[PDB]
C-alpha cells in the first residue's frame, strides 16, 4: 500500500518515526519495535491467542505467571472470533490503518531477520502477525483491571456435584 | 506509579512541569517501550507505550505532557447469584429461574510424546458475564455463585482514546478529548502544559450505579473489603443508564473526579481524595473514589510538595533519585528507642546497630539497616493496635505514625517482631550493601539496582523476588519522564530503566540499565535540532 516510513534512532535505540499517514506511521512503529522486541511480542501474541500449551505444553506459564492451559482457556474465551470482529468493526479508519501498518512493519522485520537482534530465530512460534493479533493484545490489556484479574477463577468455575 | 504535575504558581519558571514515574513490569506484555511519532503538520508526540500498541501511552508534545497511574476505582462488578433451589445451573432474577449459558473452547496441548491433544473446556455464563470461583471465598455451591461484569469488555474506544490524547494541544484540550470519549480503561491521568495548568483526572471506564441503589444493591460483607459486588437476583441492581455516558452502563464524565489547579496535583495510586489537600475531592460513588488512608509514597510526595517555595525540575528528579524510605519516618524513631531500652540484649544487637547506622535509604550504598527494616515492617504490618497515633481522617498526611511502646503488650509484641526479623536476616547469607543484594540480571552479569518496595514508601518503587543468592527486580520504575517547557521547545529528561530491548543480543539490552544503576537520566530528544545534535544518530527509510 502506502507503507512507507522514515526512521531515525537516537542514543539508546530510541526510534523517531516520520510518515505521511497512519499506515506508514504504524509501518515504522512495527518495524522498529520488532528490531528490539520481536521475540517478546511473538510470545505475548501466543499467550493472547491461547496457544501456549500448543507450543510449550501444560507444564509452563505465561509472563503473567498463569499456567499455560488455564491461560489458553481464558484467552480463547476472551479473544473469540466474534469479539475480535466486533472490536475491529468499531475502530476508526485512522486506528485500523495504524494497526495494519504495525503488522506489516513487524512482518517486514521478521522477513529480513538474521538473528542480529533476535534470540528466538527459527522457533516455530516466531511467526508473521495479523491485525487480529494486535486486537488480541489490546483486549488482553483492556481487561487487566477487570476479568483479567479473575482469569484463574473463570477457569475454575464448575457447578457443584453430588457433595 | 507516581505522578506530579506542577503549575505556574509553584514552578520556578512560572510554566508547567510534569514528573512521570509509572511503576510497571520489567518483562512481558506490559513492558514499556520508547518512541517518538510524527506525521508532519498534524501529529508530533514522544513517550513510551505498551507492546503491540501503535500509539504513545505516556508522553509529551510541543505544549503538553501527560502520564497515568492505576486508579482505585472499580472497573468491574461481581454479581452474587441466587441459584434456583432445584437446579444449581439456573439462577433467579426477580424470582424467575434463568438458565446459565455455556460457551465451550477447545485448546491444543503438546503432550509428553510431542503430539497435540485437544482439550475442551466449558465456560458458564450468566446475563452479567462469566462465573468465577475463588475457593473458600466465592464458591459455586447449591445456594449461590458469582458472575463478573467487566466494564471494559465493551470499551472499543481505547486505542482511539490514546491516539486522541497524542493529538491534544494543552491541558484544556486533553480534558475535552478524554471526557468526550471515555476510552481510558483503568488509570488516572495527570498532565501539565506550557501555560502552567496542572490537571488531575480520575476519568476512566467505571460501572455506573445511581447513588440511591447502592445501600440495597451492595453485598455488605464484600464491599466492606473493597470488592465491588452487587446483588444479582434483583434486576434493579443492573448498571444504571445515562444518555451522557459514552457507553451503556458506565459513569458519565461529569460524575468522575477532575482537579484543575495552578499549584500542583499528585497521585501515587491512592484515590482522588488528596490529589491536592488544599482542595480535597469528596462526594463520589464508592465505586469511584473513597476517603481512605493514603500510602507512604503519597505522604512522602505531599511532605515534599506542600509549602510555597518554587519547585525546579531538579527537585522532582531528586524525589525519585533520593531513594528515601519514607515508612522509616513513621517507625524508626521509636524503633531506635526500643533498641536503647534493650541494650545488651544479644539477639537485638546487630539489628539495632544496622538500623542506627542506616541512611534511611534504598541507595546502592545503603547499609543492611534497610533489610532489617523491611523484615521488621512485614511483621509490624501484622500487629493489632501497635501504632502510637492511628489513622486520623482530619490528619491524613501525618497518620498513622509512631509505635505505642507505652502499652506493655505492644512493646512486647514489637520487640518480638524485631528479634524475629533479625533472626531471619542473620540466617540468609549476607557478608554488604543494598546494591549487593538487589539486581537485574543481564546475560550472565548482574547490575545493581537502586530503589525499594513502594509499600515501604520509596518513591523510586522497585519490586524484587528472591532468586538464588539475590533479589531479582521484576517491576517498578520503568519509563521516567520529566518535562518542562522553555521557549525553544519541550525539555524532557529521563530513562527507560530496563532499556529498549528485551533481547540479550541487542545493543540496547542493558545500556539504560547501566545508567539507571548510576541514576544518570538523559535528554529525551524531541525537536529536529535535538535529534540532529545526537552523535549516535542513525536513519533508515523503508517501504513496501
Ligand atoms: C502505575 O500505577 C502504572 C501506570 C501504567 C500506565 C499504563 C499506560 C496506560 C494504560 C494503557 C492501557 C491500554 C489498553 C489497551
XYZ file of C-alpha atoms and ligand atoms in Angstrom:
722
model
C 0.000 0.000 0.000
C 1.287 3.366 1.090
C 3.502 1.553 3.520
C 6.459 3.917 3.924
C 8.291 5.335 6.934
C 11.418 7.310 7.731
C 13.007 6.110 10.979
C 15.706 7.896 12.945
C 17.273 6.381 16.086
C 18.908 8.468 18.795
C 21.129 7.252 21.681
C 19.993 4.017 23.438
C 17.954 2.914 20.392
C 15.007 5.325 20.742
C 13.169 5.454 17.377
C 11.675 8.564 15.771
C 9.139 7.614 13.113
C 8.034 10.117 10.457
C 5.298 9.211 7.979
C 2.664 10.967 5.862
C -0.266 8.920 7.187
C -1.268 6.369 9.864
C -0.463 3.322 7.726
C 3.119 4.500 7.191
C 3.404 5.547 10.824
C 2.310 2.067 12.004
C 4.734 0.520 9.488
C 7.681 2.339 11.079
C 6.492 1.551 14.639
C 6.008 -2.187 13.982
C 9.389 -2.398 12.247
C 11.358 -0.530 14.941
C 9.584 -2.459 17.706
C 10.344 -5.830 16.053
C 14.036 -4.952 15.807
C 14.218 -4.706 19.631
C 11.397 -6.982 20.786
C 10.255 -9.459 18.120
C 10.537 -12.464 20.494
C 8.657 -10.652 23.279
C 5.736 -9.717 21.013
C 5.619 -13.205 19.459
C 5.490 -14.807 22.937
C 2.753 -12.429 24.134
C 0.682 -12.964 20.999
C 0.976 -16.738 21.542
C -0.439 -16.071 25.015
C -3.252 -13.800 23.771
C -4.148 -16.359 21.061
C -4.446 -19.113 23.719
C -1.676 -21.178 22.064
C 0.834 -21.527 24.932
C 0.001 -25.227 25.563
C 0.305 -25.967 21.844
C 3.897 -24.688 21.648
C 5.097 -25.213 25.246
C 2.924 -27.943 26.808
C 0.930 -27.691 30.027
C 3.982 -27.558 32.354
C 4.872 -23.904 31.629
C 3.405 -20.474 32.472
C 2.799 -17.158 30.712
C 4.746 -13.997 31.565
C 1.752 -13.169 33.816
C 2.600 -16.377 35.746
C -0.616 -18.214 34.809
C -0.284 -21.925 33.920
C -0.364 -22.379 30.158
C -3.585 -24.359 29.866
C -5.708 -22.126 32.188
C -4.193 -19.114 30.438
C -5.106 -20.527 26.995
C -8.688 -21.291 28.074
C -9.047 -17.732 29.372
C -7.639 -16.091 26.165
C -9.564 -18.458 23.852
C -12.678 -17.304 25.705
C -11.685 -13.636 25.731
C -10.455 -13.421 22.155
C -13.210 -15.361 20.347
C -13.534 -14.532 16.632
C -16.905 -12.727 17.150
C -15.348 -10.478 19.841
C -12.354 -9.524 17.640
C -14.676 -8.853 14.692
C -16.999 -6.600 16.727
C -13.934 -4.756 18.134
C -12.473 -4.269 14.624
C -15.783 -3.002 13.203
C -15.897 -0.364 15.961
C -12.434 1.057 15.066
C -11.990 4.367 13.207
C -10.225 4.363 9.801
C -7.132 6.018 11.406
C -6.842 3.297 14.066
C -7.369 0.487 11.523
C -4.586 1.993 9.421
C -2.204 2.284 12.421
C -2.774 -1.403 13.182
C -2.465 -2.522 9.541
C 0.806 -0.574 9.239
C 2.171 -2.031 12.519
C 1.528 -5.702 11.493
C 3.150 -5.037 8.079
C 6.231 -3.361 9.583
C 6.660 -6.117 12.180
C 6.414 -8.757 9.441
C 8.905 -6.903 7.232
C 11.455 -7.075 10.072
C 10.735 -10.829 10.508
C 11.225 -11.482 6.776
C 14.731 -9.986 6.959
C 15.861 -11.056 10.462
C 19.163 -12.954 10.609
C 19.429 -13.162 14.403
C 21.468 -9.976 14.899
C 18.902 -8.843 17.500
C 16.529 -11.836 17.590
C 17.356 -14.668 20.007
C 14.287 -16.788 19.055
C 15.128 -17.023 15.336
C 13.905 -20.354 13.909
C 11.362 -21.056 16.689
C 8.031 -22.324 15.297
C 6.103 -19.670 17.307
C 8.079 -16.813 15.747
C 5.547 -16.021 13.013
C 4.144 -13.263 10.799
C 1.396 -11.420 12.719
C -2.084 -10.268 11.727
C -4.059 -7.191 12.731
C -6.336 -9.580 14.724
C -3.264 -10.423 16.853
C -2.871 -6.772 17.787
C -6.584 -6.695 18.701
C -5.901 -9.786 20.884
C -3.120 -7.914 22.721
C -5.306 -4.850 23.079
C -8.188 -6.744 24.562
C -5.807 -8.654 26.884
C -4.655 -5.299 28.303
C -8.169 -3.821 28.275
C -9.363 -6.404 30.866
C -6.347 -6.204 33.166
C -8.432 -4.026 35.585
C -11.324 -6.479 35.336
C -11.930 -10.096 34.337
C -8.177 -10.487 33.577
C -7.583 -10.411 37.374
C -10.037 -13.355 37.616
C -8.646 -15.500 34.814
C -7.847 -18.469 37.124
C -11.236 -18.068 38.829
C -13.114 -18.120 35.498
C -11.292 -21.327 34.519
C -12.095 -22.895 37.948
C -15.831 -22.142 37.789
C -17.631 -25.529 37.685
C -21.063 -26.440 39.087
C -21.488 -28.466 42.276
C -21.589 -32.268 42.039
C -23.423 -34.579 44.424
C -21.492 -33.481 47.628
C 3.207 4.599 39.998
C 3.828 8.269 40.934
C 2.848 11.387 39.008
C 3.284 15.087 39.878
C 2.061 17.964 37.699
C 3.238 21.450 38.739
C 1.661 24.723 37.603
C 2.567 28.400 37.210
C 2.062 29.222 40.900
C 4.708 26.725 42.068
C 7.053 26.150 39.131
C 10.315 28.105 39.134
C 9.757 29.343 35.558
C 6.016 30.014 36.019
C 5.171 27.431 33.337
C 4.002 23.797 33.649
C 6.125 20.818 34.672
C 5.383 17.057 34.801
C 7.094 14.143 36.517
C 6.029 10.724 35.219
C 7.222 7.745 37.285
C 4.967 4.762 36.363
C 5.814 1.520 38.206
C 5.174 -1.429 35.933
C 6.632 -4.860 34.942
C 10.217 -5.153 33.735
C 9.196 -8.026 31.423
C 6.207 -9.227 29.391
C 3.037 -7.785 27.867
C 3.245 -4.534 29.878
C 6.930 -3.749 29.277
C 7.180 -0.063 28.277
C 8.948 0.950 25.023
C 10.093 4.431 23.974
C 9.199 6.041 20.679
C 8.522 9.388 19.013
C 5.744 9.558 16.361
C 5.348 12.312 13.747
C 3.041 12.938 10.844
C 4.363 16.321 9.816
C 1.705 19.051 10.128
C -0.717 17.138 12.363
C 0.967 14.819 14.899
C 4.179 15.064 16.913
C 4.373 13.176 20.214
C 7.013 11.229 22.089
C 6.988 8.981 25.122
C 6.528 5.276 25.843
C 3.926 2.576 25.108
C 2.973 -0.996 25.941
C 3.842 -3.833 23.498
C 1.683 -4.064 20.348
C 0.121 -0.570 20.657
C 0.725 1.875 17.785
C 0.108 4.999 19.969
C 2.059 6.775 22.747
C 0.677 5.864 26.205
C 2.692 8.229 28.400
C 4.359 11.193 26.740
C 4.638 14.798 25.711
C 4.260 17.129 22.766
C 5.018 20.765 21.930
C 2.922 22.317 24.783
C 1.736 19.285 26.816
C 2.962 16.352 28.895
C 0.761 13.708 30.470
C 1.090 10.491 32.445
C -1.039 7.846 34.130
C -1.305 5.927 37.382
C -3.506 2.955 38.203
C -6.584 4.321 39.983
C -8.567 2.911 42.953
C -11.839 2.976 41.010
C -13.744 -0.228 40.256
C -13.765 -1.293 36.611
C -15.996 -4.340 37.047
C -18.652 -5.648 39.397
C -19.092 -9.093 40.830
C -22.707 -10.218 40.983
C -23.806 -12.704 43.656
C -26.332 -15.021 42.038
C -29.160 -16.651 43.963
C -29.292 -20.143 42.497
C -32.543 -21.914 41.643
C -33.098 -24.147 44.681
C -33.988 -27.006 42.275
C -31.064 -26.580 39.848
C -27.593 -25.060 40.569
C -27.083 -24.327 36.847
C -30.028 -21.900 36.989
C -30.242 -18.549 38.822
C -33.030 -16.252 39.960
C -33.617 -12.706 38.808
C -36.792 -11.136 40.252
C -37.914 -14.576 41.408
C -37.663 -16.039 37.881
C -35.352 -19.005 37.143
C -32.981 -18.364 34.232
C -30.591 -20.906 32.659
C -26.858 -20.285 32.558
C -25.373 -20.251 29.058
C -22.403 -22.463 28.113
C -19.565 -21.481 25.787
C -17.025 -24.231 25.015
C -13.478 -23.519 23.907
C -11.003 -26.031 22.566
C -7.272 -25.859 23.212
C -4.429 -27.831 21.632
C -1.956 -29.280 24.142
C 1.544 -30.559 23.257
C 1.998 -33.823 25.176
C 4.914 -35.782 26.626
C 5.204 -37.516 23.215
C 5.341 -34.194 21.276
C 1.904 -34.794 19.722
C -1.113 -32.473 20.088
C -4.264 -33.382 22.089
C -7.487 -31.391 22.059
C -8.865 -30.232 25.416
C -12.388 -28.894 25.597
C -13.500 -26.627 28.410
C -16.935 -25.229 29.191
C -17.267 -21.602 30.360
C -20.563 -20.937 32.136
C -22.099 -17.501 31.585
C -24.927 -15.519 33.117
C -26.596 -12.317 31.835
C -23.846 -10.394 33.745
C -20.853 -12.273 32.379
C -18.832 -15.410 33.199
C -18.976 -17.174 36.539
C -15.848 -17.062 38.708
C -14.804 -19.289 41.643
C -12.342 -18.305 44.416
C -12.266 -21.432 46.605
C -13.168 -20.655 50.235
C -14.413 -17.187 49.302
C -16.529 -17.043 46.113
C -17.720 -20.644 45.784
C -20.287 -22.106 43.388
C -22.398 -24.206 45.778
C -26.124 -25.149 45.747
C -27.248 -21.725 47.029
C -25.030 -19.138 45.390
C -22.419 -18.433 42.752
C -20.629 -15.327 41.412
C -20.570 -13.762 37.980
C -18.281 -10.928 36.869
C -19.264 -7.999 34.642
C -16.229 -6.229 33.228
C -16.965 -2.655 32.056
C -14.049 -2.596 29.630
C -15.244 -5.580 27.531
C -17.396 -3.134 25.551
C -14.805 -0.365 25.567
C -13.929 -0.362 21.873
C -12.666 3.244 22.204
C -9.339 2.560 23.984
C -6.936 2.949 21.013
C -8.823 5.916 19.551
C -8.593 7.438 23.055
C -4.754 7.346 23.212
C -4.450 8.448 19.600
C -6.683 11.381 20.544
C -4.520 12.112 23.622
C -1.444 12.060 21.269
C -3.081 14.889 19.250
C -4.001 17.053 22.288
C -2.581 20.598 22.341
C -2.817 21.592 26.029
C -4.477 20.588 29.317
C -7.907 22.009 28.374
C -7.776 20.078 25.074
C -6.634 16.867 26.791
C -9.546 17.124 29.257
C -12.082 17.656 26.443
C -10.702 14.673 24.477
C -10.741 12.277 27.445
C -14.156 13.355 28.741
C -15.756 13.174 25.272
C -14.535 9.686 24.506
C -14.264 7.931 27.928
C -11.925 5.323 26.436
C -9.447 5.129 29.334
C -9.769 1.681 30.972
C -8.185 1.767 34.437
C -5.863 4.728 35.016
C -5.812 8.289 36.346
C -4.424 10.962 34.003
C -2.134 13.751 35.215
C -0.839 16.464 32.920
C 0.820 19.897 32.721
C 1.098 22.379 29.875
C 3.255 25.337 28.801
C 0.738 27.884 30.159
C 1.143 26.363 33.667
C -2.066 24.402 34.204
C -1.813 21.265 36.355
C -4.540 18.643 35.692
C -5.697 15.517 37.514
C -8.477 13.277 36.112
C -9.955 10.118 37.570
C -11.544 9.778 34.110
C -11.876 6.083 33.194
C -14.468 3.424 32.460
C -16.365 2.776 35.728
C -19.642 0.812 36.187
C -22.466 3.269 36.930
C -24.980 2.657 39.709
C -27.222 5.564 40.797
C -26.480 6.523 44.467
C -29.943 5.600 45.798
C -29.417 1.973 44.607
C -26.119 1.362 46.395
C -27.234 0.647 50.016
C -29.501 -2.226 48.864
C -27.528 -3.355 45.793
C -24.158 -3.803 47.569
C -23.099 -7.143 49.056
C -22.371 -5.712 52.555
C -19.648 -8.188 53.606
C -17.763 -7.838 50.287
C -17.875 -4.070 49.844
C -16.519 -3.800 53.417
C -13.366 -5.415 51.948
C -13.322 -3.207 48.820
C -14.619 -5.843 46.407
C -17.197 -4.237 44.048
C -20.004 -6.758 44.463
C -23.711 -6.411 43.667
C -26.975 -8.381 44.253
C -27.504 -10.393 41.015
C -31.032 -11.585 41.953
C -32.655 -8.131 41.526
C -32.924 -6.519 38.067
C -32.780 -3.082 39.744
C -29.042 -3.727 40.506
C -28.213 -3.646 36.786
C -25.734 -0.874 35.956
C -27.609 2.404 35.525
C -28.147 4.023 32.107
C -27.469 7.699 31.455
C -27.584 9.367 27.974
C -24.463 11.433 28.876
C -22.244 8.306 29.224
C -20.189 7.210 26.179
C -21.031 3.547 26.764
C -24.213 1.918 28.144
C -23.842 1.340 31.911
C -20.679 3.440 32.573
C -20.342 6.570 34.761
C -20.843 9.905 32.897
C -17.680 12.048 32.767
C -19.412 14.765 34.859
C -19.549 12.401 37.820
C -15.833 11.464 37.825
C -13.150 13.412 39.775
C -11.273 16.191 37.997
C -8.963 18.767 39.606
C -7.502 21.620 37.594
C -5.008 23.730 39.521
C -2.090 26.100 39.115
C -0.023 24.872 42.062
C 0.221 21.057 41.838
C -1.641 17.751 41.628
C -0.148 14.421 42.616
C -1.076 10.732 42.686
C 0.651 7.599 43.923
C -2.229 5.048 43.437
C -4.484 6.271 46.253
C -7.959 7.575 45.460
C -8.753 11.035 44.068
C -9.253 12.375 47.622
C -5.907 14.017 48.446
C -4.691 14.774 44.902
C -4.093 18.226 46.438
C -5.050 18.540 50.164
C -5.866 22.247 49.690
C -8.831 21.072 47.586
C -9.960 17.622 48.764
C -12.054 15.579 46.273
C -15.086 14.194 48.115
C -18.700 13.070 47.494
C -18.107 10.488 44.751
C -19.570 6.996 44.381
C -17.794 4.281 46.406
C -17.076 2.624 43.008
C -15.234 5.796 42.000
C -13.312 7.353 44.921
C -13.282 6.954 48.702
C -11.658 8.924 51.503
C -9.164 6.241 52.600
C -5.765 6.497 54.373
C -3.026 7.331 51.847
C 0.053 5.176 51.305
C 3.563 6.263 52.322
C 4.593 7.243 48.745
C 1.790 9.818 48.583
C 2.568 11.002 52.144
C 6.192 11.363 51.082
C 5.269 13.342 47.953
C 2.932 15.590 49.924
C 5.636 16.232 52.594
C 7.960 17.449 49.783
C 5.335 19.475 47.885
C 3.420 21.452 50.494
C 4.669 24.946 51.299
C 5.105 27.860 48.921
C 8.687 27.563 47.642
C 9.267 27.302 43.865
C 9.743 23.770 42.507
C 12.504 23.195 39.977
C 12.965 20.205 37.632
C 15.837 19.043 39.870
C 13.517 18.982 42.931
C 11.207 16.459 41.249
C 14.112 14.417 39.908
C 15.601 14.115 43.416
C 12.261 12.946 44.846
C 12.912 9.840 42.724
C 16.727 9.536 42.970
C 16.924 10.142 46.754
C 15.541 6.618 47.372
C 14.161 7.791 50.714
C 12.427 5.006 52.660
C 9.562 7.118 53.906
C 7.935 4.373 56.016
C 11.022 4.740 58.258
C 9.797 8.274 59.181
C 6.795 6.574 60.795
C 8.563 3.994 62.962
C 12.364 4.466 63.069
C 12.490 6.948 65.960
C 10.508 4.580 68.195
C 12.380 1.547 66.898
C 15.655 3.199 67.995
C 14.124 3.957 71.422
C 13.243 0.225 71.785
C 16.847 -0.660 70.851
C 18.192 1.627 73.604
C 15.550 0.282 76.038
C 17.055 -3.180 75.381
C 20.816 -2.513 75.316
C 22.997 -5.587 75.935
C 20.298 -7.917 74.582
C 22.298 -10.280 72.357
C 19.564 -11.188 69.845
C 18.946 -7.492 69.007
C 22.494 -6.076 68.916
C 23.314 -6.351 65.167
C 19.828 -5.233 64.084
C 19.978 -2.191 66.360
C 23.466 -1.216 65.172
C 22.495 -1.717 61.491
C 19.377 0.438 61.966
C 21.320 3.241 63.763
C 23.981 3.269 61.017
C 21.414 3.279 58.174
C 20.969 6.275 55.890
C 17.150 5.603 55.744
C 17.594 4.950 52.012
C 17.377 2.303 49.321
C 20.566 3.514 47.625
C 23.119 1.118 46.142
C 25.305 2.065 49.126
C 22.566 1.833 51.765
C 23.612 -0.418 54.640
C 21.958 -3.608 55.894
C 19.643 -1.447 58.085
C 17.234 -1.372 55.106
C 16.963 -5.185 55.064
C 16.357 -5.408 58.817
C 13.838 -2.580 58.475
C 11.919 -4.377 55.698
C 11.672 -7.687 57.545
C 10.595 -5.804 60.705
C 7.901 -3.855 58.835
C 6.434 -7.035 57.274
C 5.867 -8.265 60.835
C 4.748 -4.875 62.218
C 2.098 -4.900 59.451
C 0.534 -7.959 61.185
C 0.256 -6.428 64.672
C -3.020 -5.127 66.118
C -3.128 -1.601 67.601
C 0.644 -1.028 67.563
C 0.510 2.494 66.059
C 1.048 5.297 68.590
C -1.238 7.540 66.518
C -3.731 5.552 64.361
C -5.128 6.898 61.083
C -6.853 10.212 61.823
C -9.162 11.376 58.992
C -8.553 15.033 59.989
C -4.763 14.402 59.949
C -4.391 12.109 56.856
C -0.926 13.441 55.918
C 0.686 12.637 59.292
C -1.104 9.458 60.387
C -0.584 6.659 61.184
C 2.752 7.362 62.972
C 4.915 6.060 65.837
C 4.882 2.915 67.963
C 2.682 2.639 71.110
C 5.648 1.481 73.220
C 3.891 2.799 76.367
C 1.392 -0.088 76.046
C 3.020 -3.241 77.570
C 1.563 -5.833 75.113
C 2.612 -3.685 72.127
C 6.151 -3.161 73.499
C 6.440 -6.931 73.992
C 4.999 -7.748 70.533
C 7.112 -5.107 68.788
C 10.309 -6.352 70.464
C 9.448 -9.920 69.396
C 8.902 -8.789 65.766
C 12.345 -7.176 65.709
C 14.005 -10.298 67.224
C 12.229 -12.498 64.643
C 13.072 -10.142 61.773
C 16.704 -10.098 62.898
C 16.911 -13.905 63.093
C 15.551 -14.198 59.512
C 18.180 -11.711 58.286
C 21.046 -13.423 60.206
C 20.013 -16.763 58.651
C 20.250 -15.763 54.965
C 23.839 -15.418 53.706
C 24.854 -11.729 53.878
C 28.635 -10.824 54.081
C 27.367 -5.912 52.050
C 25.109 -3.111 50.855
C 21.607 -2.865 49.291
C 23.079 -2.830 45.729
C 24.977 -6.068 46.504
C 21.600 -7.751 47.018
C 19.084 -6.189 44.633
C 19.972 -6.655 40.978
C 18.735 -7.045 37.431
C 20.294 -9.970 35.561
C 21.576 -9.199 32.059
C 23.049 -12.263 30.362
C 25.364 -13.772 33.000
C 26.026 -10.396 34.633
C 24.068 -8.632 37.375
C 23.508 -4.887 37.510
C 22.908 -3.303 40.932
C 19.511 -1.541 41.093
C 18.565 1.274 43.492
C 15.066 1.642 44.982
C 12.804 -0.475 47.134
C 9.255 -1.618 47.547
C 6.544 1.062 47.257
C 4.990 -0.430 50.378
C 7.999 0.938 52.351
C 7.361 4.424 50.952
C 10.254 4.534 48.472
C 9.147 6.925 45.717
C 11.523 5.060 43.357
C 9.495 1.871 43.793
C 11.188 -1.388 42.870
C 9.670 -4.855 43.371
C 12.055 -7.801 43.516
C 11.900 -11.557 44.204
C 14.416 -13.953 45.800
C 16.304 -15.845 43.043
C 19.305 -17.846 44.235
C 21.603 -15.557 46.209
C 19.992 -12.233 45.147
C 16.783 -10.203 44.900
C 15.874 -10.048 41.196
C 13.918 -6.982 40.032
C 10.576 -7.820 38.369
C 8.740 -4.443 38.328
C 8.791 -0.788 39.372
C 10.241 2.426 37.995
C 10.199 1.872 34.258
C 9.751 4.795 31.860
C 10.853 8.027 33.568
C 9.954 11.322 32.003
C 10.381 14.806 33.481
C 9.200 17.610 31.177
C 9.399 21.415 31.297
C 8.535 23.988 28.631
C 11.248 26.537 27.805
C 10.651 28.747 24.725
C 12.772 26.605 22.327
C 10.568 23.509 22.756
C 9.764 20.901 25.355
C 12.730 19.904 27.501
C 12.345 16.311 28.617
C 14.715 14.149 30.672
C 14.539 10.538 31.801
C 15.319 6.917 31.034
C 13.785 3.562 30.359
C 15.174 1.661 33.360
C 15.236 -1.833 31.818
C 16.355 -0.483 28.394
C 14.646 -0.578 24.980
C 15.207 -4.270 24.105
C 14.223 -7.439 25.990
C 16.596 -9.309 23.645
C 20.027 -10.151 25.137
C 21.595 -9.805 21.680
C 20.555 -6.165 21.351
C 22.948 -3.203 21.762
C 20.023 -1.764 23.778
C 19.500 -4.654 26.218
C 21.273 -3.046 29.183
C 22.595 0.383 28.175
C 19.922 2.425 30.023
C 20.001 -0.109 32.849
C 23.659 0.752 33.483
C 22.519 4.397 33.558
C 19.604 3.606 35.863
C 22.039 1.901 38.253
C 24.084 5.147 38.406
C 20.841 7.227 38.408
C 22.035 9.295 35.426
C 18.983 10.498 33.498
C 19.369 11.644 29.912
C 17.831 14.052 27.429
C 14.751 12.763 25.597
C 15.400 14.388 22.172
C 12.213 15.770 20.568
C 12.961 18.640 18.141
C 14.716 18.057 14.818
C 17.585 20.150 16.276
C 17.931 17.874 19.312
C 17.725 14.720 17.173
C 20.381 16.087 14.772
C 22.762 17.000 17.597
C 22.960 13.327 18.667
C 26.321 11.835 17.605
C 24.778 8.309 17.595
C 22.052 9.371 15.101
C 21.122 6.619 12.630
C 18.452 6.665 9.855
C 16.611 4.154 7.695
C 13.738 4.651 5.263
C 11.524 1.632 4.480
C 8.647 0.934 2.124
C 6.615 -1.888 0.613
C 1.174 2.876 37.706
O 0.198 2.789 38.513
C 1.044 2.137 36.401
C 0.671 3.085 35.284
C 0.668 2.301 33.975
C 0.241 3.184 32.809
C -0.034 2.322 31.586
C -0.369 3.200 30.387
C -1.874 3.380 30.276
C -2.612 2.049 30.162
C -2.743 1.608 28.711
C -3.964 0.705 28.561
C -4.083 0.235 27.118
C -5.078 -0.916 26.988
C -5.167 -1.344 25.518
